[PDB]
């Protein structure tokens, strides 16, 4: 009984496991319950804090993955399996994980709280890419990650009702954050220095905690990797939530109270069976059950809230990868496969755009097509294919990010922006996809530091750099190594618009994040649509 | 006859002419100046199509330039060469239908290719007698036969009551066409080859050349065409019949002329100067690069809109050279955009930019102007006054000239024309416009005509050599439909412009450089996108 692996938290005793990191041991406490299981009558309901337990709770293994859609489009393929659940699915899934340095840190250590992505329809804190051991060992970080409910279980709302108010998955996250405040000192964590980081939907969640007052007291700094609370996919209105919820109810044989009670009687997989049949049109980068502008968790729309908010005492790190949009094209755009090179033609490109910008009117779609065509090579298939990627990436990620970065900087935040440009040597997606959404995570988490994984030795040094930026940022609100002297990463501002490229070369400062094209998405396109 | 120069007496269909032996730098040239080609369009003939000049008796003296057609005279900048060089240099008079011929001296032994110049001036001004149109250098140096004509401008040339008998519209175009007919009939008397006639023109002259390409009865009158900084398509070169009716009756109101017959008859009783004095008061919006009386789409001279006709025309037989200057927009900014001046750097504010855009794109709805502003803003430095100044020039240039030219080049190419394309990029060392104006509209002309060949003009040596190069491109093109020198490959080649490759060349002091895409991204905005934002308003 190693006394380093024994911690008493507020609800009783836990026993972690000593894990091996390439350069030393780490203490890991996996599968800590932070809420009562949201099962039976508790489905769709806000999480309640977990009741006290007797004896020593075994926290040496990952708990169950929250009930979710599982991707079986390319069975056997590493590019997809790596995001699939690696534990039993269950509605009983509200658990978190803590990695700390071994021995337990001497003085209060900055805490990093990871929030996974998965479109609010999937994900798990237990995936290997979110392994907190490297960061804990190399940098002495206390690293926390939680499961939160996804899909219908986490985000089905009948806005206004009591039994399905929506945003409960965000409430799960908030509760794990509260848990950290109350308990992280026991692990040698500093509750007074909590940095949230997250990618894609995890990024939008982080943004939502930024924009929700009861969350603000639970962290001090935020990292948003390839996603934002603003933009076309992260939220829905009360009205559209209600509509999708009632349509799912209909699709499974089901007054709010009565409808919600009927929904509660359905096996989990039944809900997951019809999850993808409620979307208003054929689309990509669009998701059925996402946080809802409810006037409660989100007091107004993200756009409204970032325009008017005060961000004086907040540091934020935001960024994107070189090819935010490639991944998605294979999931429903005629002409795209991971298996060839997807050299499309013009007609496929125009049709691709009605799918990539599903809300787009004829005119809007046209404006997009005309903006993204290379008029010197109108019909070149390579350009058209790259363009389709760019449309999807820009509209959904890069431009929402530039907008977010801009508003936060204007309204008092310290902001650092990046573009991630290194394609992992081990990638199993084709070359034409470049650096797809999600492929920076393994680097930030420090996975190349594991000799067993066959990353190049340049990649291993790259990973060490990123871990340093992130944890420097967690420590100080500033990602720069203070010392050494590596040009400096300057803050993003609305005047200079400086951001850095993250790749094998040293930091390069660039100005303007797709500045002309995001002016198109962020300023012009809205005007075009608000004429029906 | 008896004692005078045997080389200077020529007969044409209307009678006998005496010309003048003129000095060019490299030796003498023949000039026949102020040959009448129509009955003076005066009195009851105002607004009416021209009639051929009745034959005369005796020897007509053709030794001096004749009257300039009645027109508005720019007085914004007294003594200023930048404006003066374009001003009428002969008496203003409605009696102005005259043309000019320059030939080698002595006259060519065998039929020589003919270049016909059509001057610009927005259809409200111009003159074939300006110093920049001096045909002597092209005649002396390239052995060209050069012809230029006066045609009626402003109301006299373009005021229309479409449908009517007495003011059918497009008569300035008809003046031009009559001079084309005169050349077919009479040019061989000067050693010119009626079977090898190239039209060249700049700005409204270019638009004019374009209308002739698009109008059947003009087709038989020439073989090849050069369009410099102007197209018949685009937002300023034509008006709808309805709009010309509007502008013409409004002008009539302004001068106290309150059916068509009775109105036109009243207009005919008005002094020419009254018409000119009210000419600018009829435009639907505050604007630049818009002129009150211009060619009308009459379903006659122009059987449909130039856009319609270029989109669906067969241009099998057509060789066309087309291009633009580097800064088509700069000139206009100082006329009617607040913030701009010839006398300072014109560093404007964002607000003066948004206002500028409303004036320069006067047909734009609010959404359209937003699009323009959105497209032309540099989002890294959106308040930078130098960028905004240059974007304002670019908006005006792109919208009125560069993109119309790209549109013209592409449509003509896609439909069988051999098209050569250029951007002229050298600023005259003698230019008196400020440096920020770059290479303004009109400032290639003096080069193509070979003025730098005149030692007294103060051009640099490089400019003298550059002019010779340009004169060679132009006259090779007139001779053969190809600007390239056949016996020469030490120099780089000028490829045809095609829809596939979109090649054009830079004209500056440096050897030819081939570039691809004529503002291809931006012109896709003006040519493909913007029309649709005017459809669904
Ligand atoms: C050019 O230079 C001469 C002599 O150097 C000067 O006196 C004259 O005024 C100038 N003439 C022109 C045409 O610019
Ligand atoms: Cl250019």
Swiss-Prot record, chain B:
Tissue distribution: Predominates in most expressing tissues except erythrocytes where a glycophospholipid-attached form of ACHE predominates.
Compartment annotation: Synapse; Secreted; Cell membrane
Active site residues per record: 203 (acyl-ester intermediate), 328 (charge relay system), 441 (charge relay system)
UniProt-listed Enzyme Commission number(s): 3.1.1.7
Pfam family of the protein (one): AChE_tetra
Top-level EC class: hydrolase
Gene Ontology cellular-component annotations: basement membrane; cell surface; extracellular space; Golgi apparatus; neuromuscular junction; perinuclear region of cytoplasm; plasma membrane; side of membrane
A molecular function GO annotation: serine hydrolase activity
Cystine pairings recorded for this chain: 69-96, 257-266, 403-523
Membrane topology: Peripheral membrane protein
GO biological process, one term: osteoblast development
Source organism superkingdom: Eukaryota
Catalytic activity: acetylcholine + H2O = choline + acetate + H(+)
InterPro entries referenced in this protein's UniProt entry, alphabetically: AB_hydrolase_fold, AChE-related_enzymes, AChE_tetra, CarbesteraseB, Carboxylesterase_B_AS, Carboxylesterase_B_CS, Cholinesterase
Glycosylation sites recorded in the entry for this protein: 259, 344, 458
Chief site of localization: other
Keyword annotations from UniProtKB, A to Z: Cell membrane, Disulfide bond, Glycoprotein, GPI-anchor, Hydrolase, Lipoprotein, Membrane, Neurotransmitter degradation, Secreted, Serine esterase, Signal, Synapse
Subunit structure: Isoform H generates GPI-anchored dimers; disulfide linked. Isoform T generates multiple structures, ranging from monomers and dimers to collagen-tailed and hydrophobic-tailed forms, in which catalytic tetramers are associated with anchoring proteins that attach them to the basal lamina or to cell membranes. In the collagen-tailed forms, isoform T subunits are associated with a specific collagen, COLQ, which triggers the formation of isoform T tetramers, from monomers and dimers. Interacts with PRIMA1.
Family from the record: Belongs to the type-B carboxylesterase/lipase family.
Role this protein plays: Terminates signal transduction at the neuromuscular junction by rapid hydrolysis of the acetylcholine released into the synaptic cleft.
Further remark: Synapses usually contain asymmetric molecules of cholinesterase, with a collagen-like part disulfide-bonded to the catalytic part. A different, globular type of cholinesterase occurs on the outer surfaces of cell membranes, including those of erythrocytes. This is the catalytic subunit of an asymmetric or soluble form of ACHE.
Protein name: Acetylcholinesterase
Organism of this sequence: Mus musculus (Mouse)
Underlying gene: Ache
